[PDB]
Amino acid sequence: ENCEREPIHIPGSIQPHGALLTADGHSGEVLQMSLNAATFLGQEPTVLRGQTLAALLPEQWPALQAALPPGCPDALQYRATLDWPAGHLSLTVHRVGELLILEFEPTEHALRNAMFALESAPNLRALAEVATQTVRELTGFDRVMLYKFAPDATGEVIAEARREGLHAFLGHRFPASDIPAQARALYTRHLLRLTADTRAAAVPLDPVLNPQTNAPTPLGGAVLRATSPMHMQYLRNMGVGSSLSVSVVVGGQLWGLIACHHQTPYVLPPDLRTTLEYLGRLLSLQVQVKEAADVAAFRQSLREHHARVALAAAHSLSPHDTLSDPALDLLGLMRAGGLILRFEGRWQTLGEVPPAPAVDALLAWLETQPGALVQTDALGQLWPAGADLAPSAAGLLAISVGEGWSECLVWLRPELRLEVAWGPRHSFDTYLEEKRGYAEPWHPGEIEEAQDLRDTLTGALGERLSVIRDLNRALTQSNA
């Protein structure tokens, strides 16, 4: 119930497969330190506590402070490899406030070929398939998926690269409840996340509170962050050991999220994580290319039909006489059953349309809607009173030429029934309850041609204005 208010940013504990130290970003005096760090680094904790970073790491300090000035964001990272008698470790540092955060992990042509493979993917399906195929090759994970977040905050499993002897997760959809808001904010900032074990116990820090502020330490930028005790339980019921997610951020929005699950507890080398980090950058880029090609190809086919409607609405002195002529046919362009044409006051219908008292109720609903365009494939969801009028009007596309919904075109698609079918299964049942009655979902190539008719009709709303005044001016001349 109150699982959306849990502070994920402040666990106060780390994952037991490395070491963590946080120290003041001016003095270098060691403040906070995990319990395990004494055994890991192979030094007495009394020595480490109250020691400068100029003493412990005497060569890395004049490089650490240079690359990390006070003022830089807590997204900037600095990696280094150093040798210790206790073998050679991995050092990863960053800066929060005036506190340097040190991370320690034990360390020990495929990328270039993958790059060109992604750049020469024909569509978004093939890009998704290849990306997942590459990840499974380099890492050697069992299951590797790719969610795509719908603008109603629901994930959709579009691709998979699985091991033989496991059921497919393809086509799976999960609600907004599983990924809360505070998690989504953190995943927009920090692109990588790693969980080596799900049944392992968290290692606390000593002392827990940062004496600089007397406040808990924010460890959002840390890879060794202990994961939620609810998300672990979720993966325990399925029986999943390792989890690695790489977030896809497009235009400052969380596009999608690769998830790499494993049956057995697994710890990945930090040399291969960097390769994945690179792939995350490459997959955020190419998605913006492939989805741009998905619409541009779709529009190209219908453009011959589109140009006849656009040029006729360009010199539209009559909105009724030209935009109702069957030689244009506005139903076939958008693949819809019904069309409503409301101009000047008179409402005109074309094709299969709901009854007249319901029409005047539908146009009353669109006026109350603040948006310029109304896009819905289920009108029963948005408008509860107009759910019985689905047989003729299930999917709706409405544009207001001008503003105020005085002059508007409405597209109506026929009714089609949809039923969802497949602990992930109790999350699946919440998605099952939401959907009842739907229609054919709107293609984004159609939306771009729908809003291109808006720009040529409203441009004619100015040419129409001129001659109307002229008719008034000539009338007054005849009156005088």
Ligand X SMILES: C=CC1=C(C)/C(=C\c2[nH]c(/C=C3N=C(/C=C4\NC(=O)C(C)=C4C=C)C(C)=C\3CCC(=O)O)c(CCC(=O)O)c2C)NC1=O
Rounded to a whole number, what is the largest CA-CA distance in the chain?
Answer: 107
Binder among 469, 477, 478, 480 for its own copies (CB under 8 A): 469
- HSE-CB for 140 with a 13 A CA cutoff: 6
CB-based contact 187:257 (threshold 8 Å)? yes
- Rounded to the nearest 10 degrees, the angle between the axes of helix 124-138 and helix 270-312 is 180
Binder among 26, 189, 236, 281 for its own copies (CB under 8 A): 281
CB of 185 to its own copies, least distance (A): 18
By CB under 6 A, is residue 107 in contact with ligand X? no
Question: Looking at 115-123, 229-237, 349-357, 457-465, which segment touches ligand X (CB under 6 A)?
Answer: 229-237
By CB under 8 A, is residue 264 in contact with its own copies? no
CB-based contact 37:206 (threshold 8 Å)? no
Residues between 395 and 424 that touch ligand X (CB under 6 A): 424
The dihedral formed by the CA atoms of 228, 229, 234 and 237, expressed in degrees to the nearest 10: 150
By CB under 8 A, is residue 254 in contact with its own copies? no
By CB under 8 A, is residue 282 in contact with its own copies? yes
142 to 14, 88, 166, 169, 283: CA distances (angstroms):
26, 29, 9, 13, 21
Q: At 225, list the tokens.
A: 């962050």
Looking at the Cβ atoms of 166 and 293, the one nearer to ligand X is 166
**Chosen from ligand X, its own copies, none, partner binding at 186 (C-beta under 5 to 8 Å by type):** ligand X
Number of residues that bind ligand X (CB under 6 A): 20
Residues 6+ away with beta carbon under 8 Å from 265? 196, 197, 198, 199, 200, 241, 242
Question: Looking at 79-87, 136-144, 232-240, 427-435, which segment touches its own copies (CB under 8 A)?
Answer: 79-87
- Separation CA 223–CA 19 (nearest Å): 11
- Residue 3 annotated as lining a ligand binding site: yes
- Separation CA 96–CA 75 (nearest Å): 9
Looking at the Cβ atoms of 179 and 399, the one nearer to ligand X is 179
By CB under 6 A, is residue 245 in contact with ligand X? yes
CB of 180 to ligand X, least distance (A): 5
By CB under 8 A, is residue 278 in contact with its own copies? yes
By CB under 6 A, is residue 186 in contact with ligand X? yes
Concatenate the DSSP letters of all residues of 231-279 into one string: HHHHHHHHT---EEEEEEEETTEEEEEEEEE-SS-----HHHHHHHHHH
By CB under 8 A, is residue 55 in contact with its own copies? no
- The CB density around residue 397, as the number of other CB atoms within 10 Å, is 20
Q: At 103, list the tokens.
A: 């991370």
**Chosen from ligand X, its own copies, none, partner binding at 343 (C-beta under 5 to 8 Å by type):** none
Q: Are strands 203-206 and 173-174 parallel, antiparallel or unpaired?
A: unpaired
CB of 199 to ligand X, least distance (A): 15
Binder among 300, 385, 459, 474 for its own copies (CB under 8 A): 459
Q: At 468, list the tokens.
A: 């109307």
Question: Looking at 38-46, 52-60, 73-81, 134-142, which segment touches its own copies (CB under 8 A)?
Answer: 73-81
By CB under 6 A, is residue 180 in contact with ligand X? yes
Strands (E), 328-438: 338-343, 346-351, 373-376, 395-401, 407-413, 416-417, 437-438
CB of 424 to ligand X, least distance (A): 4
Question: Looking at 6-14, 125-133, 151-159, 457-465, which segment touches its own copies (CB under 8 A)?
Answer: 457-465
366 to 404, 407, 415, 421: CA distances (angstroms):
9, 11, 20, 33
CB of 254 to ligand X, least distance (A): 10
Interface mask (CB under 8 A) for its own copies, residues 381-420, using x and -? --------------------xxxx-xx-------------
Residues 6+ away with beta carbon under 8 Å from 133? 161
Question: Looking at 48-56, 112-120, 122-130, 227-235, which segment touches ligand X (CB under 6 A)?
Answer: 227-235
What's the Rg (C-alpha) of the chain? 30
Binding site residues, its own copies, CB under 8 A? 67, 72-73, 75-81, 109, 112-113, 115-117, 119-120, 274, 277-278, 281-282, 284-285, 344, 401-404, 406-407, 458-466, 468-469, 471-472
Task: Report the binding-site residues for a tetrapyrrole.
Answer: 3
Task: Report the binding-site residues.
Answer: 3
